[PDB]
Design a protein around this ligand. Structure first.
Ligand code: MG
Ligand code: ZN
Length: 2008
RNA sequence: ACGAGUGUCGUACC
RNA sequence: GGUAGUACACUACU
RNA sequence: AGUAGUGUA
């Protein structure tokens, strides 16, 4: 941890050049890690630190009286010992990831100490403390030791040692001897998976083709390699080395040629520019005109928004019946003649209620009351229309189509030519997007929309989002709050809210619409209506009707049918719209999308116009068509390529960009993109980089400058680069998934697949070539690279085969693998004609391969039941299937993604799944070792990897450039020399691969299989036979696609499908070279990595020819490549290098069969983009807008709480990806609004709970009771929706704890709960506490409990609606048929249930046996929810059903009442009322409050830590986020009590045998003991037994299913208790790098409070608590950390800012009276003295005496006499630094000065400076000399306490005169130009005192000339009289900080001028209490306009005038 | 009419 | 020409 | 363990 020791290790690594000493380096590194952990553990435990203390020594120490030689002490050396309570504990520190060494050392030490334990009559305990370096989880075996130490708070980081190990291994990676020397064990191969290999593989036609393709020597080499057995051979790498040596000549020749190409390359690469963009645009428009039908008519446009809107009418009433009457009258009174005017008038007559409004209301109310009285739908009773006036009414807003009221001809005209009901190869018609008239029409449309919608609403901006989240959003960003207020005031919000409400009403009324009825939908607007036409994927037909007084005052986005005159104005009818419920639901959610988009685009940008942003967002948010889809996604490639250094944007536009402009908005956005391309080319040079700050240990202040110089894209303004990237990339997420149509997408996907297959069949005939032919692989280079990479990878780890089998469950059963037991679909081949009934297709097409789709688990059940599969180890069965399954069949379906063209998705059969599983797991485990591979990297860690690569490339650039240009810089401190100096080049190739799986040479994987060392020859033969049979796979065409292709009746021109299928005579097509998408990810990625390694070699050699330095980092996921190249050379310009690098990148991709997408491949100098993730310049960046937009996404629609928890997930992910707090809060508000809208809980609505509960606002109601979340954003991110209860409890603590403990730790504050008075609690608090006590917890719980259930062990759902829903067909499931047979079997259920009781662990864990699996599969069918999931369900239909059933009795209140002490289903409102009634009778007591606190907070260490962070937080100096970084969330529960896996522990507990398969005998015993203790102390077994007994007695018969359910919850709780370290991968973008839990919490809290700036957070006490997950914590930690921080801060502050002489007196004075963090510093000093950590404060102790020479001896042991020390420190006056020897220096570690604000004490008055305020000073404590000398007199005036000082020179004497540090910045001279700033030791003239002197002189001169009221000067007697007047004035009035700072500044000026005597003699002038003339004088004050004091003097005068006027 | 489409579709049926 | 089972939301500062 | 959702390729 020590930085000097880190430097020492770095020097050892750098200077080392022998692999024999690198082992010494690594061993020393491991010892340093162990000793560091031991020292930190001893500090935490507060025990004296020892290492390898002799056992005889410890025996003598514990028993000095006994004579030595009484017994031979064992030679073992314990790390440390501890003797308390007559028990000796032998402690051993271990820093390992495993327990093998721990257990063997435990056994050895125990055996060797038994004899001494018996003799000396002392029990000896062997305690092994083990820490896991990668996840800091502590493991302790001795429970007695853990009893001694209840809280162990070891919080340390091992990242430094990992970095050194990585540096050593990368330096000596090329040395195979070093790898062998550091290898663990030898090369070991497990037992062969198969006993025999395929003999028919050699006869396979595919193998014959491959063999004939290869030349003869390669055929021989392939046969030898596949027939090679590593275990039999003397060396495993015998054949690998032979092949590598054979191919070395060709490999070296290829590398040398490719390197020689650098000279032949010119400087001209594919630069994007305006000419290329224009030519590409011309080619694109030509291609689009050829492929489409271009229309120049505006009347051919399609609706941009399927809606028309008009402002409301304040004069008219908003009652529903009045609106209906008004609509009927307006429809009837249409004047004029038109096509449908008579139909509209007839409809208005049909809906004419007349004057019988009361009768209509009564009829509708009676119907609704009848409907709502039943949980189920009312059946068998027919609704009969009632005639009211001329209206035949069936329901509210439902009317008959009366044949008498409408002519038949008019009715058919309307229904067919208008609504399309009863209605009934050319090119798709699209508008001309390049036509000037068409673009002018689009501009006119957008201008009209802006004009109509920019006006004010005229109504209150009050709404749910604002009311419930305005405070949070305002505190986060007042500007965001103001933007929201403006948005809600404008008319865009009213229009989109009206459209959403109206569309929800349309969806509600369309469910029960009949064929002869039409519905009327109404919204809050009294002028906007909807008429829903009859309808039967369900569709909705609606027409929007708008009433407006003035014509042309309507908002028409190309949806209007016509505007007609009526009574009292005009009526406008929109054209009929037919939409899918999926698009309708998006429209309903659209307000959230609109608000999110507007706030994202406007955030932190004053140069943008909110009107323009909303004008764009209203169209993108409501876009539900493919027209905008065709533009959003290609825009990324177009604009990003244009900004790039090298890109083929011209070819991209010409060949791929295909705008689909069916709408005027699409035309407008096409023009926007076109302009943005040229602008992006023009403005690529305005990107600038921040000044890098390098500390040589970490990088801070890195990235890209924030200057708004780039032009905005979609709307006028200026943006930063980050905002520009957001504007480029966010629009892709405006698209909607599932917009495609199955018919067309199946046709296109089949066409693409068959076209690729046909092209491969015809054109592609060569497999191996040397000239980089398309779809061809260079054989020699491939083989050589594969050999090299395989050698390196398998040399890295010696047990690769064992690791594969262990991690992939190869040795375990088939039923224990998730991918083989899932509910995903799989293909089944065979005769299934009966189930499928299709008949016509079967008869008409002979060669039809019959197939059916089934679930994976069902297929596994079938194969197990038919004995095709067994429960033997899975790998043996997999290889058996590799031989048996000769024919592979696949089918495909469309993904339905959000891109313009859908993606084909392939489904395979079970045997193919298993074979590919084996191959892919082998490839995966070899990819894990390779650093370049990125699929093996867990998700979201790729951001951290990108950051690390960028940081090391920055460091390499700086170091290499400085090292090379040292000579030139020395010569400078010449222009000709500067010309010839070396320059740095940085290159980022963000690349894409074209047709990764479609066009790939599958033969290159044969070599990967054959050259693999870890496989046996028989395994290789079987796998190669599988691959050969895979290359003969057949694609089964889908039945629906075949149906449509057979129902055409007109022959297609060139039907590729018919050609490939023999004129539709077969449904199967043979696919050979296209390994199917997604099946061979790891293998393809490995070969991609090998290709990039060859590229790296080529680049390194080529740069070697240039005598330069290069660093190449390549990241490869599957087909997405991120290659960054850093070059520092001087021979040639950068253009030649860029051209050469790009040409060789393309050539290297083509060499290995890959093909880079040059259209989508672009080169940048700074920006990295690997997988939707960006690294701007060392600084991580991500588009969190996608997570922000997914806040309104679909959910399970289970209930109000379940729905909310799903969307808070998206909010939290957005927070993790860098979303600012205000936008995160907006997303949370939108999620709450969406849920409340779904369940009709919005304010004022029926299910709104605010009235029924004692709460002022919905923040007071619990989430489970339908409140809104109220908690800090850091809490929401960390604990995740438990934050509601946590925040409520913390607020209760902060409100009711006594003042003495108010600033104590959470455990102490909870211990003080017994003193609470329950009578003082408010009604809301009482209600919430009762809810927590009785609804969340159990009545049996007692405050005396020591262990209890954690919040993760219990659910939170209370009010969940129930639905009467049919299960579905489920006919095709063989397992379901077996389950039905078993159910119909006599009593089979009792046996199956009995088996599940006998093996209860099967309920929660996977079974390890076929019988166990088959029983579980049969059992799951009992649960209704599983069957519902099995049936396909539409989320759109579920959402509408939840809306409709909101008033029906759905809540089962019996279950809720069963929760507390001791009917029919109930509605939401009645449930609220009943819950309040039930809770009224219950009582609450201090005992109950203690139970709540103990069971909610004291259980979880994470909950305790979060509560401590909230209570004890101190917020420091604000600062702008300069350089961000990634940091993963650490583990909050470090202590581990269970070692074994939870499944194994549960299996052992179900039985009583600690000895289980795969379970360590003795290790499982303690886990079983712990689990039994947990069960007994929580009384789970007793509670379950009592519950089942009571239920059995109540029912009268044994409810066996109830017993199963009880066992399920019991084992669920047991599983949650015994769950081990999950170690989730959760990374965060944070202002700084965090290493420990406290650092992470500080960074989270400081980052998630304000949008503008982030704060430094330190904690008053120690936040972390040492405890276990389910054990109560009643012990708080010590204050030693506070003492350490205090005295480190004190020593270093005194050294830095105090003169050498005054330092000791300063220390003594501050020790005597001051206090740190509410703790007296004398007490902290006593803690340090009377403690076992005194070697960290040797200089501090020396200055205060102490030492006693024991500390010096201990320090020497860590590596010196007292008098020698005293003599040596004669010249040194440093409090923090002392010299024990002539060169040895004992020092105290530094602490950040931001914590100095925690010191409180009496003033330290010396000279005129009061040092207390200096410690409290914020500006003047900075270490940099420049920053100190450049501070202001406003800050400096705080330190002035003169009381009669004459000279500032003697006043400032009490300041440090040692040299300070200053930041010197230098340029780098690289193609991306940037400056690095590094602090360096300054010379003598720059000291703290000198900086203060310069500050004083400059600022006082400025202030003097600012306040020379008289012309003579500052010292003139008249000016002095004016100063006397002003000081008397300010003394006479109330003190203000303006007055104080002005007084201090004038005082310091007078001290400089030596006017102090009169200053202290200032009094009221004799000419002056005439307040009138004081006012006259101050109003006559000649205030100057000097800029710093201009605002200051005016404010001071104004405040004085206001105060003196308020006085009178 | 609307959704989709350089694949004949959905658009309630006999 | 005839046929076309199918119980309910919003109801508002507008 | 099952189910749902989201992001990624
Ligand atoms: Mg990419
Ligand atoms: Zn003074």
């Amino acid at each position: 941890m020590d930085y000097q020791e880190y430097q020492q290790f770095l020097a050892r690594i750098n200077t080392a050049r022998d692999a024999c000493v690198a082992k010494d380096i690594d061993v020393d590194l491991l010892m340093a890690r162990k000793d560091y952990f031991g020292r930190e553990l001893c500090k935490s435990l507060n025990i004296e630190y020892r290492n390898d203390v002799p056992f005889i020594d410890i025996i003598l120490d514990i028993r000095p009286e006994v004579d030595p030689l009484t017994i031979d002490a064992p030679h073992i050396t314990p790390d440390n010992y501890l003797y308390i309570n007559n028990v000796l504990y032998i402690i051993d520190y271990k820093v390992s990831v495993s327990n093998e060494s721990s257990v063997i050392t435990y056994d050895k030490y125990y055996e060797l100490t038994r004899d001494i334990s018996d003799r000396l009559s002392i029990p000896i305990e062997i305690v092994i403390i083990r820490i896991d370096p990668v996840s800091r989880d502590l493991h302790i075996n001795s429970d007695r030791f853990k009893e001694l130490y209840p809280t162990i708070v070891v919080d340390i980081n091992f990242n430094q040692f990992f970095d050194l190990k990585q540096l050593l291994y990368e330096k000596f990676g090329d040395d195979e001897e070093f790898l062998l020397k550091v290898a663990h064990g030898d090369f070991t191969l497990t037992a062969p998976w198969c006993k025999t290999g395929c003999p028919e593989f050699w006869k396979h036609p595919i193998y014959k083709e491959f063999k004939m393709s290869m030349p003869v020597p390669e055929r021989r080499l392939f046969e030898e390699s596949v027939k090679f057995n590593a275990y039999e051979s003397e060396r495993w790498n015998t054949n690998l080395v032979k092949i590598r040596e054979y191919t070395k000549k060709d490999y070296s020749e290829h590398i040398s040629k490719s390197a020689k190409n650098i000279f032949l390359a010119s400087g001209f690469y594919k630069q994007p520019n305006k000419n290329e963009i224009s030519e590409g645009w011309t080619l694109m428009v030509e291609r689009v005109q050829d492929q489409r039908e271009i229309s120049k008519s505006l009347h051919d446009q399609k609706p941009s928004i399927h809606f028309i809107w008009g402002a409301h009418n304040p004069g008219n009433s908003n009652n529903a019946t009045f609106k209906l009457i008004l609509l009927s009258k307006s429809l009837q009174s249409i004047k004029g003649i038109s096509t449908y005017t008579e139909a509209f008038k007839s409809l208005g007559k049909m809906m004419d209620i007349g004057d019988k409004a009361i009768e209509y209301e009564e009829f509708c109310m009676s119907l609704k009351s009848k409907a709502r009285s039943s949980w189920k739908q009312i059946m068998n009773k027919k609704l009969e229309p009632k005639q009211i006036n001329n209206a035949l009414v069936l329901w509210e807003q439902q009317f008959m189509i009366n044949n008498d009221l409408i002519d038949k001809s008019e009715k058919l005209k309307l229904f067919k030519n208008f609504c399309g009901i009863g209605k009934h190869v050319s090119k798709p018609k699209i508008l001309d997007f390049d036509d000037a008239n068409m673009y002018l029409a689009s501009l006119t449309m957008m201008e009209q929309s802006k004009k109509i919608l920019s006006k004010s609403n005229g109504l209150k901006p009050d709404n749910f989002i604002l009311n419930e989240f305005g405070s949070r959003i305002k505190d986060a960003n007042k500007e965001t709050y103001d933007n929201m207020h403006k948005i809600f005031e404008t008319g865009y919000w009213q229009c989109i809210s009206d459209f959403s409400t109206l569309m929800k009403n349309i969806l509600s009324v369309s469910q029960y619409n009949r064929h002869n009825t039409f519905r009327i939908a109404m919204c809050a607007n009294n002028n906007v209506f909807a008429i829903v036409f009859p309808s039967a994927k369900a569709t909705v037909v609606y027409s929007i009707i708008v009433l407006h007084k003035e014509e042309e005052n309507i908002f028409n986005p190309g949806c209007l049918h016509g505007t007609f005159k009526c009574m009292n104005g005009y009526i406008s009818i929109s054209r009929a719209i037919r939409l899918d419920k999926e698009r309708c639901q998006r429209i309903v959610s659209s307000p959230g999308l609109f608000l999110t988009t507007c706030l994202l685009f406007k955030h932190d940008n004053p140069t943008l116009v909110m009107s323009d942003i909303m004008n764009f967002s209203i169209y993108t948010s409501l876009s539900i068509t493919k027209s905008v889809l065709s533009l959003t996604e290609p825009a990324r490639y177009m604009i990003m390529n244009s900004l790039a250094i090298s890109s083929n944007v011209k070819d991209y536009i010409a060949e791929k960009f295909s705008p689909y402009t069916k709408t005027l908005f699409s035309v407008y956005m096409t023009r926007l993109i076109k302009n943005a391309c040229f602008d992006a080319y023009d403005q690529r040079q305005r990107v600038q980089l921040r000044d890098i700050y390098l500390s040589d240990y970490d990088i801070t202040q890195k990235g890209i400058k924030d200057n708004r110089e780039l032009t905005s894209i979609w709307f006028p303004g200026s943006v930063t680069l980050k905002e520009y990237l957001t504007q480029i990339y966010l629009p892709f997420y405006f698209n909607a998934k599932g917009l495609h149509e199955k018919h067309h997408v199946m046709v296109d996907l089949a066409k693409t697949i068959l076209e690729i297959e046909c092209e491969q069949r015809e054109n592609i005939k060569e497999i191996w070539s040397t000239n980089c032919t398309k779809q061809t692989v260079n054989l020699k280079i491939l083989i050589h690279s594969l050999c090299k990479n395989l050698l390196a990878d398998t040399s890295r780890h010696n047990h690769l085969r064992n690791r594969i089998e262990n991690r992939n469950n190869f040795r375990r059963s088939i039923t224990t693998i998730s991918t083989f037991t899932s509910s995903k679909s799989c293909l089944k081949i065979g005769d299934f004609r009966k189930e499928k009934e299709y008949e016509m297709l079967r008869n008409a097409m002979p060669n039809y391969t019959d197939y059916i789709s089934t679930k994976v688990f069902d297929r596994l059940y079938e194969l197990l039941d038919k004995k095709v599969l067994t429960d033997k180890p899975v790998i043996e069965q997999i290889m058996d299937m590799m031989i048996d399954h000769k024919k592979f069949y696949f089918t495909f379906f469309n993904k339905g993604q959000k891109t313009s063209k859908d993606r084909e998705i392939f489904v395979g059969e079970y045997e193919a799944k298993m074979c590919m599983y084996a191959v892919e797991r082998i490839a995966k485990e070899r990819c894990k070792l390779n650093p370049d591979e990125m699929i093996s990297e867990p998700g979201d860690g790729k951001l951290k990897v990108l950051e690390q690569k960028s940081e090391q490339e920055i460091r390499f650039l700086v170091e290499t450039t400085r090292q090379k240009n040292r000579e030139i810089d020395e010569a400078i401190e010449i222009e000709k020399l500067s010309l010839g100096k070396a320059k740095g080049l940085k290159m980022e190739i963000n690349a894409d691969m074209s047709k990764w799986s479609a066009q790939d040479v599958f033969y290159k994987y044969f070599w990967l299989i054959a050259l693999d060392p870890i496989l046996y020859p028989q395994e290789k033969e079987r796998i190669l036979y599988f691959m050969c049979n895979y290359m003969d796979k057949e694609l089964i065409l889908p039945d629906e696609l075949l149906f449509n292709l057979l129902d055409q009746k007109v022959a297609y021109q060139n039907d590729i499908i018919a050609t490939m299928t023999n004129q539709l005579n077969s449904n199967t097509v043979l696919i050979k070279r296209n390994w199917l998408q997604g099946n061979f990810n790891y293998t393809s990625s490995y070969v991609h990595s090998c290709a990039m390694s060859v590229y790296k070699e080529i680049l390194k050699e080529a740069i070697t020819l240039l005598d330069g330095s290069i660093l190449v980092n390549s990241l490869v996921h599957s087909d997405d490549n991120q290659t960054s190249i850093t070059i520092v050379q001087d021979k040639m310009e950068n253009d030649k290098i860029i051209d050469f690098a790009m040409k060789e990148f393309e050539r290297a991709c083509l060499t290995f069969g890959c093909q880079a997408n040059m259209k989508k491949t672009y080169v940048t100098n700074c920006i990295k983009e690997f997988v939707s993730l960006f690294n701007l310049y060392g600084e991580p960046f991500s588009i969190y807008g996608r997570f922000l937009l997914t806040s309104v996404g679909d959910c399970a629609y289970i209930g109000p709480y379940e729905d909310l928890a799903s969307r808070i997930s998206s909010a939290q992910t957005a927070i993790k990806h860098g979303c600012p707090p205000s936008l995160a809060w907006v997303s949370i508000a939108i999620s709450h609004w969406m849920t409340s809208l779904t369940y009709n809980m919005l304010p004022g609505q029926s299910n709104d709970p605010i009235d029924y509960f004692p709460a002022e606002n919905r923040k007071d109601i619990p989430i489970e009771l339908n409140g809104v979340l109220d908690a800090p954003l850091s809490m929401i991110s960390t604990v995740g929706l438990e934050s509601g209860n946590l925040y409520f409890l913390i607020k209760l603590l902060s409100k009711y704890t006594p003042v003495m403990q108010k600033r104590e730790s959470v455990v102490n504050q909870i211990a003080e709960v017994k003193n609470w008075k329950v009578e003082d609690l408010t009604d809301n608090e009482i209600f919430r506490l009762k809810i927590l006590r009785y609804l969340v917890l159990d009545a049996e719980m007692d405050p005396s409990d020591i262990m209890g259930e954690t919040s993760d062990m219990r659910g939170r759902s209370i009010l969940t609606p129930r639905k009467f829903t049919t299960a579905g067909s489920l006919r095709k499931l063989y397992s379901f048929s077996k389950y039905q047979d078993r159910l119909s079997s006599p009593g089979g259920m009792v046996e199956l249930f009995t088996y599940l009781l006998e093996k209860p662990e099967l309920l929660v864990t996977k079974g390890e046996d076929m019988k166990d699996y088959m029983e579980s599969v049969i059992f799951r069918y009992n649960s209704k929810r599983f069957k519902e999931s099995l049936s396909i369900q539409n989320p759109a239909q579920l959402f509408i059903e939840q809306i409709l059933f909101s008033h029906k009795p759905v809540i089962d209140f019996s279950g809720i009442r069963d929760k507390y002490i001791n009917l029919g289903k109930v509605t939401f409102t009645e449930a609220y009322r009943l819950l309040m009634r039930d809770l009224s009778s219950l009582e609450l007591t201090n005992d109950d409050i203690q139970v709540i606190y103990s069971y909610i907070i004291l259980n979880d260490p994470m909950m305790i830590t979060i509560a401590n962070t909230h209570i004890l937080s101190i917020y420091g100096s604000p600062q702008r986020r300069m350089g961000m970084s990634c940091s993963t969330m650490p583990e909050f529960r470090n202590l581990k009590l269970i070692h074994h896996s939870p499944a194994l522990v549960l299996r052992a507990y179900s039985k009583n045998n600690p000895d289980i398969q795969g379970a360590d005998p003795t290790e499982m015993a303690r886990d079983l003991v712990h689990l039994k203790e947990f069960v007994e102390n929580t009384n789970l077994e007793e509670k379950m037994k009592v519950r089942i007994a009571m239920n059995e007695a109540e029912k009268g018969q044994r409810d066996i299913v109830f017993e199963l359910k009880e066992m399920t919850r019991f084992y669920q709780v047991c599983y949650e208790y015994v769950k081990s370290t999950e170690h989730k991968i959760k990374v965060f973008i944070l202002p700084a790098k965090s290493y420990t839990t406290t650092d992470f919490c500080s960074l989270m809290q400081g980052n998630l409070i304000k949008d503008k700036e982030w704060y430094t957070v330190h904690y008053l006490k120690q936040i972390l608590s040492g405890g276990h997950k389910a054990i109560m914590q009643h012990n708080a930690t010590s204050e030693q950390n506070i003492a350490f921080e205090c005295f480190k801060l004190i020593t270093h502050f005194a050294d830095s800012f105090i003169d050498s002489l005054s330092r000791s007196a300063f220390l003594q004075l501050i020790i005597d009276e001051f206090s740190y963090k509410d703790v007296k510093v004398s007490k902290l000093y006593d803690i340090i003295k009377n403690g076992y950590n005194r070697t960290d404060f040797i200089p501090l102790l020396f200055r205060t005496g102490d030492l006693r020479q024991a500390d010096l001896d201990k320090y020497d042991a860590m590596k010196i006499l007292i008098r020698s020390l005293d003599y040596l420190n004669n010249d040194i006056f440093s409090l923090s630094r002392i010299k024990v020897g002539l060169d040895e220096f004992a020092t105290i570690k530094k602490a950040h000065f931001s914590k100095m604000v925690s010191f409180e004490g009496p003033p330290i008055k010396t000279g005129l400076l009061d040092l207390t305020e200096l410690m409290k000073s914020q500006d003047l404590l900075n270490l940099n000399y420049d920053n100190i000398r450049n501070s202001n007199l406003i800050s400096f005036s705080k330190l002035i306490c003169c009381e009669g000082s004459d000279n500032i020179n003697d006043g400032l004497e009490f300041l440090s005169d040692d040299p300070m540090n200053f930041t010197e910045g230098e340029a780098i001279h690289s193609t991306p130009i940037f400056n690095i700033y590094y602090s360096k030791r300054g010379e003598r003239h720059m000291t703290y005192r000198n900086a203060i002197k310069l500050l004083i002189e400059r600022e006082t001169k400025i202030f003097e000339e600012a306040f020379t009221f008289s012309e003579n000067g500052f010292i003139s007697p008249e000016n002095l009289g004016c100063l006397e007047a002003v000081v008397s004035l300010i003394k006479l009035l109330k003190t203000n900080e303006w007055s104080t700072v002005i007084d201090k500044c004038i005082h310091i000026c007078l001290i400089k001028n030596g006017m102090d005597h009169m200053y202290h003699s200032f009094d009221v002038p004799k000419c002056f209490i005439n307040w009138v003339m004081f006012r006259e004088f101050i109003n006559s004050l000649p205030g100057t306009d000097i800029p710093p004091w201009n605002v200051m003097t005016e404010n001071f005068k104004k405040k004085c005038i206001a105060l003196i006027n308020s006085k009178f």
